[PDB]
Amino acid sequence: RFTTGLVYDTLMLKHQAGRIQSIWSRLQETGLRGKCEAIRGRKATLEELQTVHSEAHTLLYGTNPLVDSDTIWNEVHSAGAARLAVGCVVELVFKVATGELKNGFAVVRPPGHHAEESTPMGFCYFNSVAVAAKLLQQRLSVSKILIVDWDVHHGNGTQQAFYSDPSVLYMSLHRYDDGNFFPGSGAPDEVGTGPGVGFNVNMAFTGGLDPPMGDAEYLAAFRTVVMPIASEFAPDVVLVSSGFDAVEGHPTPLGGYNLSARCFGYLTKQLMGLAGGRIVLALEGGYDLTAICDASEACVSALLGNELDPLPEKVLQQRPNANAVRSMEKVMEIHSKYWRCLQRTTSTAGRSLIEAQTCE
Ligand SMILES: O=C(c1ccc(C(O)(O)C(F)(F)F)s1)N1CCn2c(-c3ccccc3)cnc2C1
Numbered sequence: 001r002f003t004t005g006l007v008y009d010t011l012m013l014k015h016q017a018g019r020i021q022s023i024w025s026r027l028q029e030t031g032l033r034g035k036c037e038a039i040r041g042r043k044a045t046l047e048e049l050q051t052v053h054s055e056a057h058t059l060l061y062g063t064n065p066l067v068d069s070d071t072i073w074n075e076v077h078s079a080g081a082a083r084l085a086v087g088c089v090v091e092l093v094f095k096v097a098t099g100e101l102k103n104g105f106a107v108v109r110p111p112g113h114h115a116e117e118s119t120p121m122g123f124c125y126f127n128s129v130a131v132a133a134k135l136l137q138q139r140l141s142v143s144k145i146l147i148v149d150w151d152v153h154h155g156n157g158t159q160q161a162f163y164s165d166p167s168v169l170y171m172s173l174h175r176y177d178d179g180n181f182f183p184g185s186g187a188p189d190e191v192g193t194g195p196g197v198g199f200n201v202n203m204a205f206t207g208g209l210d211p212p213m214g215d216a217e218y219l220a221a222f223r224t225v226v227m228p229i230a231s232e233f234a235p236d237v238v239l240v241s242s243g244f245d246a247v248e249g250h251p252t253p254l255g256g257y258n259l260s261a262r263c264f265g266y267l268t269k270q271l272m273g274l275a276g277g278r279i280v281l282a283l284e285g286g287y288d289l290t291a292i293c294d295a296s297e298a299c300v301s302a303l304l305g306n307e308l309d310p311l312p313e314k315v316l317q318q319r320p321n322a323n324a325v326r327s328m329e330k331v332m333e334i335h336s337k338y339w340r341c342l343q344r345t346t347s348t349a350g351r352s353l354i355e356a357q358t359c360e
Pocket residue numbers: 111112113114122123124151153182243245253254284285286
């Protein structure tokens with residue numbers, strides 16, 4: 001059936017209910033699982049992993065040496081789970097990209113976007129989303145790939161992986177606060193290198209939690225930075241590093257923002273307007289079970305084409321806070337040098353959604 005894909009595998013579970021098991025259960029209980037096609041995953045091959053990572057890294061963490069969660073064998077299993085997470089994502093990406101499925105959501109762990117060429121970090125061993133993109137390039141010759149990363153932390157590995165490639169547009173929305181938030185990378189001025197100059201976009205929020213960024217601020221960032229640039233780029237496939245740690249309920253250092261889960265349904269629906277709807281979302285961060293389950297539900301519902309719960313009038317009427325406007329305007333200023341959609345006008349970043357619409 002030409003519909004929404006899901007990927008999930010119990011061999012990724014720690015105990016052999018955590019995050020991915022709670023999400024899977026929510027999708028079952030709400031009936032959304034019933035409307036999707038659940039595919040079978042597989043371990044990534046060592047060669048696939050080596051499209052992004054070094055042979056030495058892949059051999060060390062990818063190979064089995066041959067479980068109490070409070071021993072070193074917990075981390076050995078997590079590295080195994082990571083190898084499996086990459087093959088689950090690759091499989092879903094290819095089924096959507098070939099037209100077998102319309103779109104997809106990958107319920108996987110551990111996350112991948114912090115993993116660098118030969119350095120695991122931030123709970124990440126292998127960069128699943130980056131590996132998928134490389135394989136779409138090398139095996140299907142896909143001309144344009146947009147990667148959107150809306151986990152609250154900068155996706156340092158994915159930026160690295162494509163920093164000189166103009167055929168892949170990497171766009172990260174993250175808390176930055178002038179280099180004082182993990183992992184410390186992803187300044188707005190990091191725009192790419194060589195031929196890839198201008199094809200790396202760091203929508204970096206600065207100013208701290210005075211006040212925290214919420215729905216109005218991210219919707220405005222999408223209106224002003226993400227969709228204008230993404231539309232002009234005109235990708236053939238969209239991949240999303242879909243972390244949900246920006247949702248309300250994730251405290252100050254391991255989160256700090258007050259997004260609603262509902263807002264991610266709307267962000268998804270917007271992204272569904274590109275690439276003919278060829279979109280796959282892969283779970284990254286977020287850890288509050290209720291928040292990540294609410295958000296995963298909202299995203300899958302959007303992908304299935306269901307009618308979304310209307311955002312509260314309060315959100316639609318809210319002008320973004322001054323820190324958010326300052327942050328958006330700094331990003332636009334830098335990227336006007338590279339994108340026609342940012343050269344034409346002056347900033348309307350301070351308007352609410354209704355105001356932006358009314359003035360059009
Ligand atoms: O910010 C992170 C994250 C690592 C990975 C994060 C993620 O992006 O949400 C991912 F990768 F899991 F999806 S978020 N840190 C910094 C704080 N931290 C800690 C803390 C230790 C002491 C006090 C507060 C936090 C343990 N491990 C970490 C990793």
